[PDB]
């Protein structure tokens, strides 16, 4: 039984994508707090 | 008056045998007899019938012959063993209604004034039915005659009893019916609608070919009927008709999907079932 | 309709009087959604509607109610229209009729 | 008119019943409003619209109808010219 | 289902093992706000007597609640932020803190357009919060994963308004289980078989 291929070399709520997008750091003070600040 | 007739096959093999029987003596074209039935609301059935002695001359439509005593005195024979019975019209085995069908009708019309003319053809060669039905009527038009004698179509069908049914399916053993399911469904449904269309459309061409070249005696009511046939053809170019076709189409292909789904899944159940079941009979012989 | 075929029953026709009428006519402007109607006859007994110690206390919702009916009844006979047209109808103003649409449409 | 016509505008409405626009629309409210007649105005433009919507279902089932009437009829064509036939060709 | 089976603040909350009955009422309307829409947190946990009466002793979650009730978008977020910033160190909330708030977020833009039909996306930098860019990037980027049904254009900055027909949604989620089915029952199959 078997070869062992010699001669090459939920668990997770839900799976998407699209959680693992996110590069911004946390609406909270990258978004809310960095726009939020009296620029207008 | 009337809307359908019932046909038992009784009627048939006595129309089969009479006309052989009857035909091995001499050169016979037509055979003429009496039926027997009831009725119920506006449907009438036929039970059996008994023949009568009939002659006609081919040299001329307008001299032929009947019997009246045998007709009489049979049906009273007949009434001493069946009191449900009663006369209803009569039969001709002719292929095609000749010009007499309106004296004899009238001739017989005493016994029933609601007599029902039946045709059975003895040799047919195509799978439509074989008997045709016809009551007389009074037509009248512009000019010509305030009234005319003219016969009427009327619905026929082949009807069963339950001992004539065990009696035609102990007959019936060599052919039956392969498979009962979209076989029977499609092939004794469509292709046969195909061939009748096409059919009919060859005849109706055929008294078209006669006319505008041959005899030409232009009728009218013909044409009037062919001009509401051609004006109430659809088109089917239109959008919106394409659009809803797509849609029903669209909607009705998802529940195919699904019962092929529950069919692999049971599939796969039963080989899991059998296999399990069947690996564990070889060691018990030693 | 309830309390309008209720009232007339026997033990009830017995009591018969001016309050029971009153409150006949405020069914009767609640059934076929008027505000007008309902106004009027809220004007009309003064003294016994808004009198009594806890009718005026439910007034308030019946108002607002009334006002949800007739709003429905009278945009409900067509399509596509203007603001002004409804609120001359209804008899308000422009503000509020905006509001209590967006309210509706939520 | 809502028997024969599908869309009509407006003034004509009002002009064929002999009274102004405004009566025209406030006698046809209540109307609509009590469940006797189907019409839908849109007083932007002026239009009024007598026909429902259609759904996919109608379409196909007046379309069977049709068929089924086509082939009634032409079943129906043929014994007459069988019994036309007839009495001409029987000698 | 969690908001479904958190209907027993009247039915008795014994349980004072896992957690304190505050908690329990802070729990409830959080996952109330996922869970249903409008016409049923109008008839359930705004008009709770008990909800009520513990609600009023938390300032914080009253305001919270009736910010997004009472369509007062510019104080929602702060709430948000809080209450973001709460749940990210707070257990059994942690993995997938982000997720939650990126539905709220998202559910509030879907709650005002739906009134309107051509809303310019300069009312909402007053009316929601400042920063036309950033209102800008949010809804391109939202509008690209194929949820919240509008349009913008940006040579005039308008924002329109589109109503997709209630078939197309639930077909390609009819295809997509199909997929996965069909992918699972054929690797069943060749399991077996060898």
Request: aromatic share 10%.
């Given at each position: 039984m078997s070869e062992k291929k010699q001669p090459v070399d939920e668990d997770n709520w839900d799976d998407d994508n699209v959680e693992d997008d996110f590069s911004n750091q946390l609406r909270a003070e990258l978004e809310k707090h960095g726009y939020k600040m009296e620029t207008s | 008056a009337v809307q359908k007739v019932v046909v038992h096959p009784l009627v048939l093999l006595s129309v089969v045998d009479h006309f052989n029987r009857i035909g091995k003596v001499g050169n016979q074209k037509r055979v003429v007899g009496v039926l027997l039935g009831?009725?119920?609301?506006?449907?009438?059935?036929?039970?059996?019938?008994?023949?009568?002695?009939?002659?006609?001359?081919?040299?001329?439509?307008?001299?032929?012959?009947?019997?009246?005593?045998?007709?009489?005195?049979?049906?009273?024979?007949?009434?001493?063993?069946?009191?449900?019975?009663?006369?209803?019209?009569?039969?001709?085995?002719?292929?095609?209604?000749?010009?007499?069908?309106?004296?004899?009708?009238?001739?017989?019309?005493?016994?029933?004034?609601?007599?029902?003319?039946?045709?059975?053809?003895?040799?047919?060669?195509?799978?439509?039915?074989?008997?045709?039905?016809?009551?007389?009527?009074?037509?009248?038009?512009?000019?010509?005659?305030?009234?005319?004698?003219?016969?009427?179509?009327?619905?026929?069908?082949?009807?069963?009893?339950?001992?004539?049914?065990?009696?035609?399916?102990?007959?019936?053993?060599?052919?039956?019916?392969?498979?009962?399911?979209?076989?029977?469904?499609?092939?004794?449904?469509?292709?046969?609608?195909?061939?009748?269309?096409?059919?009919?459309?060859?005849?109706?061409?055929?008294?078209?070919?006669?006319?505008?070249?041959?005899?030409?005696?232009?009728?009218?009511?013909?044409?009037?009927?062919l001009q509401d046939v051609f004006n109430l053809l659809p088109d089917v170019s239109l959008q919106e008709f394409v659009k809803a076709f797509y849609l029903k189409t669209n909607d009705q292909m998802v529940v195919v999907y699904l019962a092929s789904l529950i069919r692999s899944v049971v599939a796969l159940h039963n080989l899991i079932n059998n296999k399990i079941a069947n690996r564990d009979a070889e060691k018990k012989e030693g | 309709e309830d309390v309008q075929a209720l009232v007339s029953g026997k033990l009830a026709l017995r009591y018969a009087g001016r309050q029971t009428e009153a409150l006949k006519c405020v069914a009767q402007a609640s059934k076929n959604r008027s505000l007008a109607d309902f106004e009027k006859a809220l004007t009309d007994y003064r003294a016994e509607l808004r009198d009594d110690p806890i009718i005026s206390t439910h007034l308030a919702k019946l108002y607002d109610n009334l006002l949800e009916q007739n709003l429905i009844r009278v945009i409900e006979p067509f399509s596509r229209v203007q603001i002004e047209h409804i609120s001359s109808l209804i008899k308000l103003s422009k503000a509020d009729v905006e509001r209590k649409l967006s309210q509706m449409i939520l | 008119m809502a028997k024969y016509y599908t869309r009509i505008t407006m003034k004509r409405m009002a002009q064929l019943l002999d009274l102004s626009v405004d009566e025209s629309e406030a006698f046809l409210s209540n109307l609509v409003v009590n469940k006797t007649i189907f019409a839908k105005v849109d007083r932007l433009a002026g239009i009024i619209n007598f026909q429902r919507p259609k759904d996919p279902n109608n379409l196909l089932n007046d379309w069977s109808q049709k068929l089924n009437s086509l082939m009634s009829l032409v079943n129906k064509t043929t014994h007459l010219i069988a019994k036309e036939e007839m009495i001409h060709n029987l000698q | 289902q969690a908001a479904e089976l958190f209907l027993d603040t009247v039915s008795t909350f014994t349980s004072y093992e896992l957690m304190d009955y505050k908690t329990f009422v802070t729990y409830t309307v959080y996952v109330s706000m996922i869970a249903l829409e409008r016409p049923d947190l109008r008839e359930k946990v705004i008009k709770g007597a008990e909800i009520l009466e513990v609600l009023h002793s938390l300032p914080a979650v009253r305001q919270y609640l009736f910010s997004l009730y009472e369509c007062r978008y510019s104080v929602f977020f702060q709430s948000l932020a809080?209450?973001?910033?709460?749940?990210?160190?707070?257990?059994?909330?942690?993995?997938?803190?982000?997720?939650?708030?990126?539905?709220?977020?998202?559910?509030?833009?879907?709650?005002?357009?739906?009134?309107?039909?051509?809303?310019?996306?300069?009312?909402?930098?007053?009316?929601?919060?400042?920063?036309?860019?950033?209102?800008?990037?949010?809804?391109?980027?939202?509008?690209?994963?194929?949820?919240?049904?509008?349009?913008?254009?940006?040579v005039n900055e308008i924002v329109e308004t589109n109503r997709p027909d209630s078939k197309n949604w639930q077909y390609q989620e009819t295809i997509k289980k199909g997929d996965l089915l069909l992918n699972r029952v054929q690797k069943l199959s060749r399991v077996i078989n060898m």
């Open positions: - | 009831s009725w119920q609301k506006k449907v009438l059935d036929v039970s059996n019938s008994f023949a009568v002695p009939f002659d006609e001359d081919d040299k001329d439509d307008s001299v032929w012959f009947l019997d009246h005593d045998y007709l009489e005195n049979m049906y009273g024979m007949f009434k001493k063993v069946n009191a449900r019975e009663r006369i209803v019209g009569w039969y001709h085995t002719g292929p095609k209604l000749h010009k007499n069908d309106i004296a004899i009708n009238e001739l017989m019309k005493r016994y029933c004034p609601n007599s029902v003319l039946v045709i059975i053809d003895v040799k047919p060669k195509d799978l439509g039915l074989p008997t045709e039905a016809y009551i007389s009527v009074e037509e009248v038009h512009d000019d010509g005659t305030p009234t005319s004698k003219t016969f009427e179509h009327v619905t026929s069908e082949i009807g069963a009893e339950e001992a004539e049914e065990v009696g035609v399916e102990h007959l019936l053993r060599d052919i039956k019916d392969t498979t009962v399911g979209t076989l029977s469904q499609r092939i004794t449904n469509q292709v046969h609608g195909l061939k009748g269309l096409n059919s009919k459309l060859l005849d109706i061409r055929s008294y078209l070919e006669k006319v505008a070249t041959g005899k030409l005696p232009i009728n009218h009511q013909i044409i009037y009927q | - | - | 809080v209450v973001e910033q709460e749940m990210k160190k707070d257990w059994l909330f942690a993995p997938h803190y982000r997720y939650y708030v990126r539905e709220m977020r998202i559910h509030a833009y879907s709650q005002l357009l739906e009134s309107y039909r051509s809303l310019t996306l300069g009312y909402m930098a007053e009316a929601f919060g400042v920063g036309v860019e950033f209102i800008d990037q949010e809804l391109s980027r939202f509008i690209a994963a194929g949820r919240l049904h509008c349009k913008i254009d940006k």
